[PDB]
Design a protein around this ligand. Structure first.
Ligand SMILES: O=C(CCCP(=O)([O-])[O-])NO
Lengths: 249, 249
């Protein structure tokens, strides 16, 4: 079997109050019959909104980022501030952040660890760019990234950790990752877990899909023995999100 | 003699629902009689609370940053989001961000245009470090920075811009900045604009002092020609901020 699937919504840096309530309404009024964990990753600015309005029992609000300690970080949100705000899930390492906000292996690793010790429930991202894929550096890349996170964790910590495999090489490159290609990649990760940490940890580990997800292709993906759910982008803004939930078969 | 003063609270990376409300309530029950613009800068997370709690008329809220455009920039909060949020003020350019978050001149000046271009009032930050200062590169360094901002604005634009002179060289290095010290960087500013933009704008320009302000030295600082109010740090999460506000005549 598989663990408990997670269908996460990465709303990123989008929306308006209206657009969201609207969304959230649909969500709230959706019966999800099975065991799944729904997560909502909204803007800091819309954290209060969602928070006060998400009523469904299967859903969770989640920050899209953070910094370890409160202080003079003009512009930044720390872990404590979030905890307090009553937020216990986070998404760290997200593709757009490595690429554009120079959040390096160690940076991610260091926030991950911190999120964890504050009792956060973290979805950590990893994945290779087109270039690297092309020069068949996937496994160095993928593996390297994961151990970067590991180094910092204790065996008890993994219980808090969700890994999300971002095939950046397909994200905006007119490249279509197939289920086969996803599976081969989640497979690797798990191999690296089973071995480096434990075979116990590995089996309990949920490893989400980061590429482009949408209703049609949700079904086939998750059917893969190593895919434990989704890290949703775009459709997370529309109602297909519900369709993506249900693919959690 | 002087354009309208501003008293801006930078909360930077700090807060709590409970401690912040305490403050707000103090702020709210303060008696101000003059013509001043008080400005609370909160964490994105605290926007809603501060937005619908701060009752005072001499007070408006600001965001400590943003990106000019909505989309896929995880972790990021854009102009439009805040615009719909009901936020019309924004701190941009900040030393902490220029120092640890990639903020180049080229970067801060686009940000700045975008906000103006959107109808925000802006607190674009500028200032030199101990490294410059010492190597005698102050005028070189602050006209360049100011110029890069100007490059994209239109003269009419400046009705929407406030400058805050941050004494980087004295911020956290063991050095102090006298008022005659401030005055000089202030006067350079006033100068350049006055000279490269038009003395119409110039005398209108509000130039804030972003160095260490407190209940004790606020008046002897406010007491200088080019000093139009402040961009306060530490004394901002504290009551003595009230003293700051009064210190503007
Ligand atoms: O970052 C600053 C200068 C703060 C100096 P201090 O914390 O000593 O008041 N302003 O935004």
């Amino acid at each position: 079997s598989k663990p408990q699937p997670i269908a996460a919504a990465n709303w990123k840096c989008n929306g308006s109050q209206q657009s969201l309530s609207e969304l959230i309404d649909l969500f709230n009024s959706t019966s999800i019959n099975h065991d799944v964990q729904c997560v909502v990753a909204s803007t800091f600015v819309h954290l209060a909104m969602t928070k006060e309005r998400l009523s469904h029992p299967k859903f969770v609000i989640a920050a899209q980022n953070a910094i370890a300690k409160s202080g003079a970080f003009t512009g930044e949100v720390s872990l404590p501030i979030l905890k307090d705000f009553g937020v216990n899930w986070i998404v760290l390492g997200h593709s757009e952040r490595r690429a554009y906000y120079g959040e390096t292996n160690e940076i991610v690793a260091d926030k991950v660890a911190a999120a964890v010790a504050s009792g956060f429930m973290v979805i950590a991202c990893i994945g290779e760019t087109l270039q690297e894929r092309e020069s068949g550096r996937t496994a160095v890349v993928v593996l390297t990234q994961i151990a970067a996170i590991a180094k910092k964790l204790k065996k008890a910590d993994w219980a808090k950790v969700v890994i999300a495999y971002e095939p950046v090489w397909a994200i905006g490159t007119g490249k279509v990752a197939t289920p086969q290609q996803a599976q081969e990649a989640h497979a690797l990760i798990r191999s690296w877990v089973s071995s480096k940490i434990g075979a116990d940890v590995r089996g309990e580990l949920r490893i989400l899909y980061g590429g482009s997800v949408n209703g049609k292709n949700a079904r086939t993906l998750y059917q893969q023995r190593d895919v434990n759910g989704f890290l949703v982008g775009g459709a997370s803004l529309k109602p297909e999100f519900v369709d993506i939930i249900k693919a959690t078969q």
